Design a protein around this ligand. Sequence first.
Ligand code: NA
Lengths: 103, 104
Amino acid sequence: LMGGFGLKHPPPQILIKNTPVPADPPTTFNQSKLNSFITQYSTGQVSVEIEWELQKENSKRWNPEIQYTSNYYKSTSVDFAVNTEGVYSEPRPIGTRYLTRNL
Amino acid sequence: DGVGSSSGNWHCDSTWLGDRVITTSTRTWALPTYNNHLYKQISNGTSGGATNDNTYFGYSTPWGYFDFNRFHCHFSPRDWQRLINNNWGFRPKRLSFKLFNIQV
Ligand code: NA
């Protein structure tokens, strides 16, 4: 309902975790689980490549269609670009239904 | 080739194939008799009010001619839109021309 493709076997969940690294333990044995760990975090890159199949348009509509377009006249900033502060932003929601089709 | 047989069909279409697009258009035309079948010397000088910048000498002929030197002769509005919204450029490669289903 929120939109999209419903899949019985969707892309799998990808779980990740930093392995706990004990800080020095006591010198004489104790049953209790360790609760003192070295403070750490991780970082790295991640890549996702997806192949999409397109269904080309085959319309005999004579007149031009509606199309998503960038604004023409001057503006303080560029839509879908960064700030003077380096902040990226999406000015508006962009749908998918521009071309038309008969029923 | 007979009186009762069409000598061609109506081909009007467009197909996009990759780095190519083929346009095809057919139209119905009418051709009258021009100049009463004659060739005539036509001229315009500097008499009356006709300025010198517009003088000329030439001829009118009994012939007509086909012309399709205009993009809309080949691209429908939608096709033109498909072209200009997605390509950095384009150019003509080859053409076929045909005259048929002639009736006098
Ligand atoms: Na935009």
